[PDB]
């Protein structure tokens, strides 16, 4: 599974710093990639878990922040 | 053996957080270069952010005493446009104010930089221009900027005059009355200043600035890299003047 | 060619309250008489607890020449609870944009702040009054629980209101979602069938609306402006909307379907920064039975002949075709940064020739940049090029804001009853409203 995590707006950075290291200490094994120069973190090799923690805490602490989910 | 005039103006909104460090390190990396140009050399430094008005900024007392409320994260709070260090032979000074710069905050991508350009180079008196010099101003952001018109969902709609309006403090006095210049407005000042205006800015953001520099005169582009000297590259091709 | 410029109706607000920032005609029902709408969005009024919430005032055209405010909102601040205001009305600029279908007149307030519910937060939400008659009710379409810069919460509806024929309003709220900007029509019906006193958010189901997009249209400002015309043939005003910072800065306007709100059209300007979509009108200028369209790019610069890049506005015409197609032109200003395009107003057939004519003002051109007003004539080939009248601001510039004659007007109204619209030209930087009369 997939989950994209878009930030906007001139905190955008300071967002995805925050969600950022949450995630490596959530998950410090799971591929995280910074995309769009900083504008998208991306989570993947994840198993429809983290997806009901991580998506799930974002939108409740950082509620502006936009979260797409896919898996296969 | 021609003297030479460098501005640096610095953007510090929270979206500069991860460009920051590098920032640093182009400002102290360009004043030991310059110094191998002339030696009638001499640096300055200011900084900007954006209007501090709704909906830029959020009016609530806690966000608006600390704009980065609620990350939570500290930083500072939003201003215009501010004028530090009038240029000087002091390079040591100019290192210094440079490493204590702290981030600030606003909410939309797009920042003041606009405003920072104007003031910068028509402030003659306060930033210490040359009359026989290069005035070289380097603006330093990852994002784009607002412009005339923009600012009437703040409710400004009082037209940039292009005058100077820095108080006691070196702070825009004017930031929250008049209406963001335009593209217009600041090449009629930097022609009339005599200022190459030099922008550096991300990947991302260079063809947008690109374009830029092909309307405004005398103006360059280039990539803000860890690798800087290819900016300062720019710098010095300039100098060759002939 | 036929304005009446030489003793206008001039009126006047409270100094300082930008009289005249918005204007509109009024028309009330049978044979009743004629009105001039002015607002005034930095009125102090009478409001208790508020300062500058501003107002609409109803001004005489039969004679006298007093202007009264209409008593939209006669109250202060409401609680959400003890000591927690619900609403912030100070500074809302009430008055900022004002419209007016028969005798329904639409007045918005684009920086009034609301009280989310869930937090004590102050979000520039936005808030109309619609009053119908006698009734008068509180419409506010992004006043809801999409909150927060991703939603609603910067939304400031009312920014930019129309009307379409078929009994609709129409209203842009350029912060939604991150200033991608949204476009919401609705019902006059619904809105006043629907209103409580004590509801704060209302649904209304037959709703049309714009939706949130990827953050690449992040900073466009869709509903900055707006304009209504058919565009495709169904007999159903359809939706032209303008979206300055599009594609980069270059500028875009976008047409939408009157029925579900589906896009249609779409047009882009030619230079980064020109503010192409500033303004937009929509009107038949040929007399071909489809409506055109008119876009302003006030901040255009041209190359003179010094090879030098000058800033005088830009507008571009579009004219509509039967077989869907447009055939673009383009005016250029007359005065460098006088920003010629700011503002566009249909004039209806000025002078009785067949042909629908059309305004276009400069508001920082002129001598001490009083600010100009150019009138063009229609013709079966398009719009003519050239202006046949200009009107010249006529008040001294005080300190601040400049005259800014031109800034915003309205016409294509008879008020006098001749046979001729006439045309009502603001300038609220001296607190001032002008009516210009059309002759025979
Ligand atoms: C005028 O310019 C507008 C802006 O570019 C044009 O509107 C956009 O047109 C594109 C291309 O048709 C649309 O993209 C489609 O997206 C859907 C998927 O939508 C769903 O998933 C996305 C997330 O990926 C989500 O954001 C949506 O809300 C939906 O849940 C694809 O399946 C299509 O294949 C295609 O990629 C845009 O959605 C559309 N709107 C916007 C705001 O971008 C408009 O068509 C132009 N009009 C004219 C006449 O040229
Ligand atoms: C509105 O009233 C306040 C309080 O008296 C005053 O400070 C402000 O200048 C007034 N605004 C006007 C006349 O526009
Ligand atoms: C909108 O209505 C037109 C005309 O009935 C139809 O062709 C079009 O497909 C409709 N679009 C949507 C999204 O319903
Ligand atoms: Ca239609
Ligand atoms: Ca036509
Ligand atoms: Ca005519
Ligand atoms: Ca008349
Ligand atoms: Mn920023
Ligand atoms: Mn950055
Ligand atoms: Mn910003």
Same mark, same amino acid.
């Given at each position: 599974?997939?989950?994209?995590?878009?930030?906007?707006?001139?905190?955008?950075?300071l967002?995805?710093?925050?969600?950022?290291?949450?995630?490596?200490?959530?998950?410090?094994?799971?591929?995280? =990639?910074? =995309?769009?120069?900083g504008?998208?973190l991306?989570?993947?090799?994840?198993?429809?878990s983290?997806?009901?923690?991580?998506?799930?805490?974002?939108?409740?602490?950082?509620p502006?922040?936009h979260?797409?989910?896919?898996?296969? | 053996?021609?003297?030479?005039d460098?501005?640096?103006?610095?953007?510090?909104?929270?979206?500069?957080?991860?460009?920051?460090?590098?920032?640093?390190?182009?400002?102290?990396?360009?004043?030991?270069?310059?110094?191998?140009?002339?030696?009638?050399?001499?640096?300055? +430094?200011?900084?900007?952010?954006?209007?501090?008005?709704?909906?830029?900024?959020?009016?609530?007392?806690?966000?608006?005493? *600390?704009?980065?409320?609620?990350?939570?994260?500290?930083?500072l709070?939003? +201003?215009?446009?501010?004028?530090?260090?009038?240029?000087?032979? @002091?390079?040591?000074?100019?290192?210094?104010?440079?490493?204590?710069?702290?981030?600030?905050?606003?909410?939309?991508?797009?920042?003041?930089?606009?405003?920072?350009?104007?003031?910068?180079?028509?402030?003659?008196e306060?930033?210490?221009?040359? *009359? @026989?010099?290069?005035?070289?101003?380097?603006?330093?952001?990852?994002?784009?900027?607002? +412009?005339?018109?923009?600012?009437?969902?703040?409710?400004?709609?009082?037209?940039?005059?292009?005058?100077?309006h820095?108080?006691?403090?070196?702070? !825009?006095?004017?930031?929250?009355?008049?209406?963001?210049?335009?593209?217009?407005?600041?090449?009629?000042?930097l022609?009339?200043? *005599?200022?190459?205006?030099? +922008?550096?800015?991300?990947?991302?953001?260079?063809?947008?600035?690109?374009?830029?520099?092909?309307?405004?005169?005398?103006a360059?582009?280039?990539?803000?890299?860890?690798?800087?000297?290819?900016?300062?590259?720019?710098?010095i091709?300039? !100098?060759?003047?002939? | 060619?036929?304005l009446?410029?030489?003793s206008?109706?001039?009126?006047?607000?409270?100094?300082?309250?930008?009289?005249?920032?918005?204007?509109?005609?009024?028309?009330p029902?049978a044979?009743?008489?004629?009105?001039?709408?002015?607002?005034?969005?930095?009125?102090?009024?009478?409001?208790?607890?508020?300062?500058?919430?501003?107002q609409?005032?109803?001004?005489?055209?039969?004679?006298?020449?007093?202007?009264?405010?209409?008593?939209?909102?006669?109250?202060?601040?409401?609680?959400?609870?003890?000591?927690?205001?619900?609403?912030?009305?100070?500074?809302?600029?009430?008055?900022?944009?004002?419209?007016?279908?028969?005798?329904?007149?639409?007045?918005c307030?684009?920086?009034?702040?609301?009280?989310?519910?869930?937090?004590?937060?102050?979000?520039?939400?936005?808030?109309?009054?619609?009053?119908?008659?006698?009734?008068?009710?509180?419409?506010?379409?992004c006043?809801?629980?999409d909150?927060?810069?991703?939603?609603?919460?910067?939304?400031?509806?009312?920014?930019?209101?129309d009307?379409?024929?078929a009994?609709?309003?129409?209203?842009?709220?350029?912060?939604?979602?991150?200033?991608?900007?949204?476009?919401?029509?609705?019902?006059?019906?619904?809105?006043?069938?629907?209103?409580?006193?004590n509801?704060?958010?209302?649904?209304?189901?037959?709703?049309?609306?714009?939706?949130?997009?990827?953050?690449?249209?992040?900073?466009?400002?869709?509903?900055?402006?707006?304009?209504?015309?058919?565009?495709?043939?169904?007999?159903?005003?359809?939706?032209?909307?303008?979206?300055?910072r599009?594609?980069?800065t270059?500028?875009?306007?976008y047409?939408?379907?009157?029925?579900?709100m589906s896009?249609?059209?779409?047009?882009?300007?030619?230079?980064?920064?020109?503010?192409?979509?500033?303004?937009?009108?929509?009107?038949?200028?040929?007399?071909?039975?489809?409506?055109?369209?008119?876009?302003?790019?006030?901040?255009?610069?041209?190359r003179?002949?010094?090879?030098?890049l000058?800033?005088?506005?830009?507008?571009?015409?579009?004219?509509?075709?039967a077989?869907?197609?447009?055939?673009?032109?383009?005016?250029?200003?007359?005065?460098?940064?006088?920003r010629?395009?700011?503002?566009?107003?249909?004039?209806?057939?000025?002078?009785?020739?067949?042909?629908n004519?059309?305004?276009i003002?400069?508001?920082?051109g002129?001598?001490?940049?009083?600010?100009?007003?150019?009138?063009?004539?229609?013709?079966?080939?398009?719009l003519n090029?050239?202006?046949?009248?200009?009107?010249?601001?006529?008040?001294?510039?005080?300190?601040?804001?400049?005259?800014?004659?031109?800034?915003?007007?309205?016409?294509?109204?008879?008020?006098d009853?001749?046979?001729?619209?006439?045309?009502?030209v603001?300038?609220?930087?001296?607190?001032?409203?002008?009516l210009?009369?059309?002759?025979p």
């Open positions: 599974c997939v989950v994209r995590f878009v930030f906007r707006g001139d905190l955008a950075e967002m995805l710093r925050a969600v950022k290291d949450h995630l490596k200490k959530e998950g410090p094994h799971w591929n995280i =990639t910074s =995309t769009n120069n504008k998208e991306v989570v993947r090799g994840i198993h429809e983290d997806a009901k923690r991580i998506a799930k805490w974002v939108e409740k602490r950082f502006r922040v979260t797409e989910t896919q898996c296969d | 053996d021609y003297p030479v460098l501005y640096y103006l610095m953007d510090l909104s929270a979206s500069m957080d991860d460009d920051l460090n590098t920032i640093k390190e182009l400002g102290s990396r360009l004043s030991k270069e310059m110094s191998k140009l002339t030696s009638n050399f001499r640096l300055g +430094f200011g900084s900007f952010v954006e209007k501090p008005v709704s909906p830029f900024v959020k009016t609530t007392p806690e966000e608006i005493a *600390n704009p980065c409320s609620s990350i939570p994260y500290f930083c709070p939003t +201003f215009g446009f501010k004028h530090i260090l009038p240029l000087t032979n @002091d390079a040591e000074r100019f290192n210094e104010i440079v490493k204590n710069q702290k981030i600030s905050a606003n909410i939309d991508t797009p920042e003041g930089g606009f405003d920072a350009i104007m003031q910068a180079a028509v402030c003659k306060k930033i210490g221009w040359r *009359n @026989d010099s290069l005035h070289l101003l380097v603006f330093v952001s990852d994002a784009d900027s607002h +412009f005339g018109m923009d600012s009437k969902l703040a409710g400004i709609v009082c037209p940039n005059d292009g005058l100077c820095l108080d006691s403090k070196n702070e !825009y006095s004017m930031s929250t009355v008049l209406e963001y210049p335009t593209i217009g407005q600041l090449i009629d000042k022609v009339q200043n *005599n200022v190459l205006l030099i +922008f550096a800015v991300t990947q991302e953001q260079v063809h947008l600035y690109e374009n830029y520099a092909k309307l405004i005169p005398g360059t582009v280039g990539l803000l890299q860890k690798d800087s000297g290819n900016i300062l590259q720019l710098i091709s300039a !100098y060759e003047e002939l | 060619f036929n009446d410029v030489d206008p109706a001039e009126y006047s607000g409270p100094e300082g309250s930008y009289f005249g920032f918005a204007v509109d005609f009024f028309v029902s044979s009743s008489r004629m009105f001039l709408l002015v607002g005034a969005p930095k009125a102090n009024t009478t409001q208790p607890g508020i300062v500058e919430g501003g609409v005032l109803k001004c005489d055209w039969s004679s006298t020449r007093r202007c009264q405010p209409i008593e939209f909102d006669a109250t202060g601040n409401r609680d959400y609870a003890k000591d927690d205001p619900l609403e912030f009305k100070s500074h809302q600029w009430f008055g900022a944009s004002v419209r007016s279908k028969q005798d329904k007149i639409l007045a307030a684009p920086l009034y702040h609301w009280r989310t519910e869930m937090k004590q937060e102050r979000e520039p939400v936005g808030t109309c009054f619609l009053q119908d008659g006698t009734k008068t009710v509180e419409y506010a379409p006043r809801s629980q909150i927060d810069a991703d939603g609603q919460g910067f939304c400031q509806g009312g920014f930019s209101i009307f379409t024929k009994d609709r309003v129409l209203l842009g709220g350029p912060g939604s979602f991150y200033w991608q900007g949204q476009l919401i029509s609705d019902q006059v019906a619904e809105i006043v069938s629907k209103y409580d006193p509801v704060y958010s209302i649904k209304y189901n037959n709703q049309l609306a714009t939706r949130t997009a990827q953050a690449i249209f992040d900073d466009s400002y869709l509903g900055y402006s707006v304009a209504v015309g058919d565009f495709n043939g169904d007999g159903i005003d359809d939706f032209v909307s303008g979206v300055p599009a594609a980069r270059l500028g875009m306007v047409i939408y379907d009157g029925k579900n896009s249609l059209y779409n047009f882009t300007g030619e230079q980064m920064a020109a503010y192409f979509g500033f303004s937009v009108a929509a009107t038949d200028i040929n007399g071909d039975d489809y409506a055109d369209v008119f876009i302003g790019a006030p901040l255009f610069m041209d003179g002949s010094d090879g030098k000058q800033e005088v506005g830009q507008v571009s015409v579009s004219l509509q075709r077989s869907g197609d447009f055939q673009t032109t383009k005016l250029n200003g007359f005065e460098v940064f006088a010629f395009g700011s503002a566009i107003a249909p004039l209806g057939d000025l002078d009785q020739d067949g042909f004519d059309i305004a003002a400069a508001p920082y002129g001598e001490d940049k009083k600010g100009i007003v150019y009138i063009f004539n229609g013709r079966s080939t398009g090029a050239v202006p046949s009248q200009i009107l010249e601001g006529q008040w001294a510039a005080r300190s601040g804001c400049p005259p800014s004659f031109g800034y915003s007007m309205k016409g294509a109204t008879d008020i009853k001749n046979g001729y619209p006439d045309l009502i603001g300038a609220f930087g001296v607190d001032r409203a002008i210009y009369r059309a002759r």
